[PDB]
Amino acid sequence: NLRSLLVNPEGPTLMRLNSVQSSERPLFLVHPIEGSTTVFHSLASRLSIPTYGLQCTRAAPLDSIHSLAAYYIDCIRQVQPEGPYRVAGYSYGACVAFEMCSQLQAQQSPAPTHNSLFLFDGSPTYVLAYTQSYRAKLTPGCEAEAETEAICFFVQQFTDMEHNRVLEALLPLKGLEERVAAAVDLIIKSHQGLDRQELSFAARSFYYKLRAAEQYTPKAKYHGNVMLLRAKEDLGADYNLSQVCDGKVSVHVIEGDHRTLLEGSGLESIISIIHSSL
Ligand SMILES: O=S(=O)(c1ccc(-c2csc(-c3ccc(F)cc3)n2)cc1)N1CCOCC1
């Protein structure tokens, strides 16, 4: 449960998530904001098609969602040099996976790709909505306050700490690196064996991941068909994919909350959707 929100920063970007060895083209699953593909382990074991995960390591460029997506496409081509391509993303990862498919569409433009894109409870706008809901709590222009807010939320994912207690400890500090180091020391106190470097990279990258999400708009609409599998403020029906897609937008409501949308009842529906979708 606990170290599943962490990435080995020295780990591989592309990783097998099942033993299925077949001719059928693989499904690539893109990480949530935590960067790890652990959240997909149940799905990947249950799928009859070869499944890989994309995890966000030291190798990943986080200057933009566009750079991240270009890098993930190059990694995919080390096992599947040619399309068509099956891509899914969960939560934050739904934004990224959508960018990857747009780039792939542009690579073959204007010939249509028969690529498959699945979004698990995310979209370019669903992530954007979340970031502002945090900017709402901040003095505009105060970057130190934004850094503090992001890193506080990260520390809260590991500890039972009250919001304002973490806010106090981070707000004074010189810059991001100091805040990152303060956050790692708090988490290390609760879990000493955890790796310094692992946590440092996780805290730092959490801030840059959020920033890239804020700066993202696709260069144009995604022309491919898309499927949204969203959990049981409210953004919209199709998570406003209609504004970023001029292809078929398919919406399915899936049992569970944002976190439990990939387990139990929700997981059964996702597996049946993917298995028929082929
Ligand atoms: O991947 S998510 O889409 C996600 C989006 C935003 C934040 C966040 C926390 S704090 C902050 C911030 C933003 C802008 C600032 F200026 C300062 C802080 N953003 C976390 C997770 N997902 C939402 C659904 O449940 C799981 C997580």
Swiss-Prot record:
Compartment(s): Cytoplasm; Melanosome
Region named Thioesterase: 1-278
Modified residues (N6-acetyllysine): K174
Membrane-crossing residue ranges in chain numbering: none
Entry annotation: catalytic residues: S91, H258
Post-translational modification summary for this protein: In adipocytes, S-nitrosylation of Fatty acid synthase occurs under physiological conditions and gradually increases during adipogenesis.
Phosphoserine: residues carrying this PTM: S19
Sites of the Glycyl lysine isopeptide (Lys-Gly) (interchain with G-Cter in SUMO2) crosslink: K232
Tissues expressed in: Ubiquitous. Prominent expression in brain, lung, liver and mammary gland.
Quaternary structure annotation from Swiss-Prot or TrEMBL: Homodimer which is arranged in a head to tail fashion. Interacts with CEACAM1; this interaction is insulin and phosphorylation-dependent; reduces fatty-acid synthase activity.
Role this protein plays: Fatty acid synthetase is a multifunctional enzyme that catalyzes the de novo biosynthesis of long-chain saturated fatty acids starting from acetyl-CoA and malonyl-CoA in the presence of NADPH. This multifunctional protein contains 7 catalytic activities and a site for the binding of the prosthetic group 4'-phosphopantetheine of the acyl carrier protein ([ACP]) domain. (Microbial infection) Fatty acid synthetase activity is required for SARS coronavirus-2/SARS-CoV-2 replication.
Other notes: The relatively low beta-ketoacyl synthase activity may be attributable to the low 4'-phosphopantetheine content of the protein.
Protein name per UniProt: Fatty acid synthase
The organism of origin for this protein: Homo sapiens (Human)
From-to range in the entire protein, with total length: 2218 to 2501 of 2511
